[PDB]
Amino acid sequence: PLAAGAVILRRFAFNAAEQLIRDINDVASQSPFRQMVTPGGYTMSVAMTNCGHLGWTTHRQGYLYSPIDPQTNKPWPAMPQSFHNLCQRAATAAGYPDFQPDACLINRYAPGAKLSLHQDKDEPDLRAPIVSVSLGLPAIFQFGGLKRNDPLKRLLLEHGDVVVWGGESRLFYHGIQPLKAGFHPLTIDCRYNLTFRQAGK
Ligand SMILES: O=C(O)c1cc(O)c2c(c1)C(=O)c1cccc(O)c1C2=O
Ligand SMILES: [Mn+2]
Protein backbone atom coordinates (compact mmCIF):
# COMPACT_ATOMS: atom_id res chain seq x y z
CA PRO A 1 0.00 0.00 0.00
CA LEU A 2 1.02 3.61 -0.67
CA ALA A 3 -0.22 4.57 2.82
CA ALA A 4 -1.02 1.96 5.50
CA GLY A 5 -4.76 2.02 6.20
CA ALA A 6 -5.56 4.40 3.34
CA VAL A 7 -7.98 3.58 0.52
CA ILE A 8 -7.65 5.70 -2.61
CA LEU A 9 -10.83 5.84 -4.72
CA ARG A 10 -9.96 7.82 -7.85
CA ARG A 11 -12.93 9.60 -9.53
CA PHE A 12 -15.32 8.15 -6.91
CA ALA A 13 -17.06 11.54 -6.59
CA PHE A 14 -16.81 12.49 -10.28
CA ASN A 15 -20.52 11.92 -11.04
CA ALA A 16 -21.60 13.61 -7.77
CA ALA A 17 -19.32 16.62 -8.26
CA GLU A 18 -21.80 19.10 -9.76
CA GLN A 19 -24.26 18.48 -6.92
CA LEU A 20 -21.49 18.61 -4.32
CA ILE A 21 -20.37 22.01 -5.64
CA ARG A 22 -23.96 23.33 -5.60
CA ASP A 23 -24.14 22.26 -1.96
CA ILE A 24 -20.77 23.90 -1.15
CA ASN A 25 -22.25 27.14 -2.49
CA ASP A 26 -25.39 26.64 -0.38
CA VAL A 27 -23.34 26.02 2.77
CA ALA A 28 -21.15 29.06 2.06
CA SER A 29 -24.21 31.27 1.53
CA GLN A 30 -24.94 30.69 5.23
CA SER A 31 -21.47 30.25 6.76
CA PRO A 32 -19.14 32.10 4.40
CA PHE A 33 -15.65 31.03 3.45
CA ARG A 34 -13.12 32.77 5.68
CA GLN A 35 -9.35 32.67 6.05
CA MET A 36 -8.64 31.80 9.66
CA VAL A 37 -5.76 33.12 11.73
CA THR A 38 -3.33 30.56 13.16
CA PRO A 39 -2.14 30.59 16.81
CA GLY A 40 1.12 31.98 15.35
CA GLY A 41 -0.86 34.98 14.07
CA TYR A 42 -0.73 34.24 10.34
CA THR A 43 -3.71 34.36 8.01
CA MET A 44 -4.14 31.01 6.28
CA SER A 45 -4.10 31.08 2.48
CA VAL A 46 -6.76 28.36 2.39
CA ALA A 47 -10.31 29.66 2.95
CA MET A 48 -12.62 27.48 5.03
CA THR A 49 -16.12 26.79 6.19
CA ASN A 50 -17.96 23.80 7.69
CA CYS A 51 -21.21 21.92 7.70
CA GLY A 52 -22.65 19.33 10.07
CA HIS A 53 -23.16 19.45 13.82
CA LEU A 54 -19.57 20.53 14.45
CA GLY A 55 -17.14 22.71 12.54
CA TRP A 56 -13.39 23.08 12.78
CA THR A 57 -12.43 26.63 13.75
CA THR A 58 -10.01 28.88 15.55
CA HIS A 59 -11.30 30.15 18.90
CA ARG A 60 -9.40 31.94 21.69
CA GLN A 61 -5.95 31.32 20.07
CA GLY A 62 -6.46 27.57 19.74
CA TYR A 63 -8.27 25.23 17.36
CA LEU A 64 -11.38 23.26 18.17
CA TYR A 65 -14.64 21.87 16.93
CA SER A 66 -17.64 24.05 17.76
CA PRO A 67 -21.37 23.68 17.13
CA ILE A 68 -21.52 27.44 16.43
CA ASP A 69 -19.84 29.38 13.62
CA PRO A 70 -18.01 32.25 15.38
CA GLN A 71 -18.46 34.50 12.33
CA THR A 72 -22.25 34.22 12.23
CA ASN A 73 -22.99 33.18 15.83
CA LYS A 74 -25.34 30.58 14.32
CA PRO A 75 -24.98 26.82 13.92
CA TRP A 76 -22.97 25.62 10.95
CA PRO A 77 -25.30 24.60 8.12
CA ALA A 78 -26.65 21.05 8.28
CA MET A 79 -24.77 18.33 6.40
CA PRO A 80 -26.13 18.21 2.80
CA GLN A 81 -27.62 14.90 1.62
CA SER A 82 -25.11 14.75 -1.26
CA PHE A 83 -22.25 15.04 1.27
CA HIS A 84 -23.70 12.49 3.69
CA ASN A 85 -24.46 9.91 1.03
CA LEU A 86 -21.15 10.25 -0.85
CA CYS A 87 -19.17 9.94 2.38
CA GLN A 88 -21.10 6.88 3.49
CA ARG A 89 -20.64 5.13 0.14
CA ALA A 90 -16.90 5.80 0.20
CA ALA A 91 -16.42 4.81 3.85
CA THR A 92 -18.45 1.64 3.37
CA ALA A 93 -16.47 0.65 0.25
CA ALA A 94 -13.24 1.18 2.24
CA GLY A 95 -14.35 -1.03 5.18
CA TYR A 96 -15.72 1.59 7.60
CA PRO A 97 -19.48 0.98 7.39
CA ASP A 98 -20.21 2.60 10.78
CA PHE A 99 -18.40 5.88 10.07
CA GLN A 100 -20.79 8.66 11.07
CA PRO A 101 -19.15 12.02 10.55
CA ASP A 102 -20.58 14.98 12.43
CA ALA A 103 -18.27 17.57 10.82
CA CYS A 104 -17.27 18.38 7.28
CA LEU A 105 -14.51 20.94 6.79
CA ILE A 106 -14.70 22.61 3.38
CA ASN A 107 -11.34 23.99 2.18
CA ARG A 108 -11.10 26.33 -0.82
CA TYR A 109 -7.80 26.87 -2.62
CA ALA A 110 -7.17 29.85 -4.86
CA PRO A 111 -4.02 29.74 -7.00
CA GLY A 112 -0.98 29.78 -4.72
CA ALA A 113 -2.86 28.66 -1.62
CA LYS A 114 -1.28 25.87 0.43
CA LEU A 115 -1.79 23.93 3.63
CA SER A 116 1.27 23.50 5.83
CA LEU A 117 2.23 20.05 7.08
CA HIS A 118 0.25 19.01 10.16
CA GLN A 119 -1.62 16.20 11.92
CA ASP A 120 -5.23 15.95 12.96
CA LYS A 121 -5.07 14.29 16.35
CA ASP A 122 -7.47 16.29 18.57
CA GLU A 123 -10.59 14.28 17.70
CA PRO A 124 -11.82 12.11 20.63
CA ASP A 125 -11.81 8.90 18.57
CA LEU A 126 -8.71 8.55 16.41
CA ARG A 127 -9.94 5.12 15.20
CA ALA A 128 -12.53 6.90 13.04
CA PRO A 129 -11.19 7.54 9.51
CA ILE A 130 -11.21 10.83 7.64
CA VAL A 131 -12.84 10.86 4.21
CA SER A 132 -11.29 13.42 1.86
CA VAL A 133 -13.01 14.53 -1.38
CA SER A 134 -11.24 16.63 -4.02
CA LEU A 135 -13.06 18.89 -6.49
CA GLY A 136 -11.83 21.25 -9.19
CA LEU A 137 -8.18 21.99 -9.92
CA PRO A 138 -5.57 19.33 -9.13
CA ALA A 139 -3.30 19.59 -6.09
CA ILE A 140 -0.17 17.86 -4.84
CA PHE A 141 -0.96 16.22 -1.52
CA GLN A 142 2.06 15.49 0.65
CA PHE A 143 2.01 12.94 3.44
CA GLY A 144 4.59 11.43 5.73
CA GLY A 145 4.14 9.33 8.82
CA LEU A 146 3.41 9.55 12.53
CA LYS A 147 6.51 11.68 13.18
CA ARG A 148 7.11 15.14 11.69
CA ASN A 149 10.43 14.02 10.19
CA ASP A 150 9.18 10.80 8.54
CA PRO A 151 9.84 10.72 4.78
CA LEU A 152 7.33 12.62 2.67
CA LYS A 153 5.46 11.08 -0.23
CA ARG A 154 3.43 13.00 -2.81
CA LEU A 155 0.26 12.21 -4.70
CA LEU A 156 -1.73 14.29 -7.19
CA LEU A 157 -5.38 14.56 -6.14
CA GLU A 158 -7.70 15.37 -9.01
CA HIS A 159 -11.35 16.27 -9.51
CA GLY A 160 -13.63 13.61 -8.03
CA ASP A 161 -10.91 11.73 -6.18
CA VAL A 162 -11.82 10.39 -2.73
CA VAL A 163 -9.42 8.99 -0.16
CA VAL A 164 -10.46 7.20 3.01
CA TRP A 165 -7.66 7.69 5.53
CA GLY A 166 -7.98 4.95 8.13
CA GLY A 167 -5.69 2.90 10.36
CA GLU A 168 -2.24 4.40 10.71
CA SER A 169 -2.70 6.84 7.82
CA ARG A 170 -5.40 8.64 9.82
CA LEU A 171 -2.57 10.14 11.90
CA PHE A 172 -0.05 10.91 9.16
CA TYR A 173 1.38 14.38 8.83
CA HIS A 174 -0.05 15.87 5.63
CA GLY A 175 -0.34 19.05 3.61
CA ILE A 176 -1.10 20.57 0.23
CA GLN A 177 1.50 22.27 -1.95
CA PRO A 178 0.84 25.71 -3.49
CA LEU A 179 -2.04 25.34 -5.93
CA LYS A 180 -1.12 25.72 -9.60
CA ALA A 181 -3.38 28.14 -11.49
CA GLY A 182 -5.63 26.68 -14.15
CA PHE A 183 -9.16 26.19 -15.34
CA HIS A 184 -11.78 23.64 -14.33
CA PRO A 185 -15.22 23.78 -15.96
CA LEU A 186 -17.13 23.24 -12.69
CA THR A 187 -15.05 25.28 -10.18
CA ILE A 188 -13.50 27.79 -12.64
CA ASP A 189 -10.25 28.73 -10.87
CA CYS A 190 -10.13 26.90 -7.55
CA ARG A 191 -9.94 23.58 -5.79
CA TYR A 192 -12.30 22.48 -3.03
CA ASN A 193 -11.65 19.71 -0.56
CA LEU A 194 -14.18 18.14 1.81
CA THR A 195 -12.87 16.35 4.90
CA PHE A 196 -15.48 14.38 6.83
CA ARG A 197 -14.63 13.78 10.49
CA GLN A 198 -16.10 12.20 13.59
CA ALA A 199 -15.31 15.05 15.95
CA GLY A 200 -17.87 14.42 18.73
CA LYS A 201 -17.42 12.14 21.73
O1 LIG B 1 -6.93 18.78 0.69
C2 LIG B 1 -7.14 19.27 1.82
O3 LIG B 1 -7.46 20.48 1.91
C4 LIG B 1 -6.99 18.42 3.05
C5 LIG B 1 -6.87 19.02 4.27
C6 LIG B 1 -6.78 18.27 5.44
O7 LIG B 1 -6.58 18.96 6.58
C8 LIG B 1 -6.75 16.88 5.40
C9 LIG B 1 -6.69 16.27 4.14
C10 LIG B 1 -6.85 17.03 2.97
C11 LIG B 1 -6.53 14.89 4.12
O12 LIG B 1 -6.68 14.25 2.91
C13 LIG B 1 -6.22 14.16 5.27
C14 LIG B 1 -5.65 12.89 5.16
C15 LIG B 1 -5.37 12.14 6.31
C16 LIG B 1 -5.61 12.68 7.56
C17 LIG B 1 -6.13 13.96 7.68
O18 LIG B 1 -6.31 14.48 8.93
C19 LIG B 1 -6.33 14.74 6.53
C20 LIG B 1 -6.86 16.02 6.55
O21 LIG B 1 -6.85 16.60 7.78
MN1 LIG C 1 -5.68 18.17 8.28
**Domain parsing of the chain, residue ranges:** 1-201
CATH fold of the domain at 1-201: Jelly Rolls (2.60.120)
- The coordinates were experimentally obtained by X-ray
CA 72 to chain centre: 21
CA 171 to chain centre: 14
For residue 174, report the distance from its CA to the centre of ligand 2, in Å: 7
How many CA atoms does the CB half-sphere of 65 hold within 13 Å? 21
Vertex 79, ends 137 and 181: CA angle to 5°? Answer: 10
Q: Which of 195, 196, 197, 198 to mutate to test the pocket of ligand 1 (most atoms within 8 A of CB)?
A: 195
**20 has binding-site annotation:** no
User: For the chain, what is the HEC assignment?
Assistant: CCCCCEEEECCCCCCCHHHHHHHHHHHHHHCCCECCECCCCCECCCEEEEEECEEEEEECCEEEEECEECCCCEECCCCCHHHHHHHHHHHHHCCCCCCCCCEEEEEEECCCCCEEEECCCCCCCCCCCEEEEEEECCEEEEECCCCCCCCCEEEEECCCCEEEECHHHHHCCEEECCCCCCCECCCECCEEEEEEECCCC
163 CA closest ligand 1 atom index = 12
Angle between helices 81-93 and 17-30 (to 10 degrees): 130
Report which bound ligand comes closest to the CA of 192.
Answer: 1
Q: Which of 174, 187, 192 to mutate to test the pocket of ligand 1 (most atoms within 8 A of CB)?
A: 174
For residue 43, report the distance from its CA to the centre of ligand 1, in Å: 19
For residue 139, report the distance from its CA to the centre of ligand 1, in Å: 12
Resolution in A: 1.5
Report which bound ligand comes closest to the CA of 158.
Answer: 1
Residues lining ligand 1, judged by CB closer than 6 Å?
A: 107, 115, 120, 130, 132, 163, 165, 170, 172, 174, 176, 193, 195
For residue 19, report the distance from its CA to the centre of ligand 2, in Å: 24
Give nearest CA residue, ligand 1 atom 12.
Answer: 132
Buried residues in 126-161 as b, exposed as e (16+ CB within 10 A): eebbbbbbbbbbbbebbbbbeeeeeeeeebebbbbb
| CB-based contacts of 75, cutoff 8 Å, min separation 6 | 53, 67, 68, 69
Largest distance between two CA atoms of the chain:
43
Q: Which amino acid is at 28?
A: A
Instruction: Give dist(CA 155, CA 166) in Å, integer.
Output: 17
Handedness of CA 170, 13, 189, 81 (dihedral sign): negative
